[PDB]
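Incident log, support desk, overnight shift.

02:14 A customer reports that sequence design results differ from what the structure should imply. Their input is reproduced verbatim below. On-call engineer (initials T.W.) acknowledged and began investigating.
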C-alpha cells in the first residue's frame, strides 16, 4: 500500500493540475528522487492517465519510470465505492425542462467514471420507476442515459416514491455497509401531504447511511429542498451551470 498525503487520496482521475504537481513533490521526497521540475507534467489527472510509460520516461529521464509505476500502484489502491442514485422529477410541470435535468445527469455521469463508482437512474411522477438499476458498467450507463433522454414528462410530483425506490435499492446493497448518495432533481413543488411523505422518506435514506442532495429546477422551493437534502449546503441550482463543480467536490469530499 502507498501512504499518500490525505489530500492526494482521491482517485487520480479527479486530480487537478495542482494536485499532479503536489504528487510529484511528495514522490520526490518519499522516494529520494532527483529534483523534478514542477511543470514536468503540466496537465490534470485525466490527462496524466492517458500518458504512456514511454511518455513518463521522456518527460523525466531520471524518475519517469518510477513515477509511472507509482501511479499504477496508486490506481490499484482500495478506495471508497460510491453508489450514486439519481432521483429525477418527470412530472408534467417539468415538461418544458426535461432537457436541463437530463443534461445535468449526463454531466455527472461523465465525471464519476472511476472504477469505484456505480450509478442508478430513477424517475418519478405519479409513480417511480428504475430506468437504470445500480451498476458500474459504463455500457449499461450509456444505455440508461439514452433511455433517460427519451422520457416524456407527465403526472404528479410524488418524490417520496422516487426516494422509496432509491432506499429499496440501498437496503438490498447493504444499507449502512454502503456509501450511497441520493441526488434528487426537482422543483420541490409538492402537493398535499407529499412534503411530509418526502421528508420522512429522506430521513429513512439517512437512517440507511445515505447522503441526500437536492438539485433545484425551475423556480424551485429552496426551503422544501433544504428539508429533503442533508443540509442547505447540499442544495444546488441546476441553472448554476460552477454548480456542477460544487456538487462534484461535495460528493468527493464525503469519502
Ligand atoms: Cl486542473
Ligand atoms: Cl529527470
Ligand atoms: Cl453489472
Ligand atoms: K459514460
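02:41 Re-run completed on a clean worker. Output:
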Amino acid at each position: 500500500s502507498i501512504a499518500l498525503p490525505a489530500h492526494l487520496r482521491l482517485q487520480p482521475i479527479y486530480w487537478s493540475r495542482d494536485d499532479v504537481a503536489q504528487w510529484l513533490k511528495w514522490a520526490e521526497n518519499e522516494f529520494s528522487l532527483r529534483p523534478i521540475d514542477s511543470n514536468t507534467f503540466e496537465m490534470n489527472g485525466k490527462a496524466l492517465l492517458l500518458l504512456t510509460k514511454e511518455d513518463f520516461r521522456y518527460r523525466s529521464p531520471h524518475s519517469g519510470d518510477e513515477l509511472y509505476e507509482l501511479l499504477q500502484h496508486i490506481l490499484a489502491q482500495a478506495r471508497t465505492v460510491f453508489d450514486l442514485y439519481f432521483v429525477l422529477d418527470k412530472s408534467g410541470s417539468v415538461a418544458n425542462n426535461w432537457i436541463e435535468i437530463y443534461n445535468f445527469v449526463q454531466q455527472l455521469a461523465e465525471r464519476f467514471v472511476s472504477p469505484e463508482m456505480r450509478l442508478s437512474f430513477i424517475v418519478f411522477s405519479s409513480q417511480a420507476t428504475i430506468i437504470l438499476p445500480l451498476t458500474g458498467d459504463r455500457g449499461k450507463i450509456s444505455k440508461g442515459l439514452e433511455d433517460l433522454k427519451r422520457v416524456s414528462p407527465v403526472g404528479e410530483t410524488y418524490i417520496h416514491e422516487g426516494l422509496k425506490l432509491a432506499n429499496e435499492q440501498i437496503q438490498k446493497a447493504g444499507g449502512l455497509k454502503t456509501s450511497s448518495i441520493i441526488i434528487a432533481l426537482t422543483d420541490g413543488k409538492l402537493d398535499g401531504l407529499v412534503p411530509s411523505y418526502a421528508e420522512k422518506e429522506a430521513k429513512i435514506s439517512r437512517s440507511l447511511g445515505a447522503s441526500v442532495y437536492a438539485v433545484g429546477v425551475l423556480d424551485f422551493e429552496q426551503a422544501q429542498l433544504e428539508r429533503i437534502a442533508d443540509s442547505k449546503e447540499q442544495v444546488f441550482p441546476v441553472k448554476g451551470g460552477q454548480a456542477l463543480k460544487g456538487i462534484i467536490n461535495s460528493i468527493l469530499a464525503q469519502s
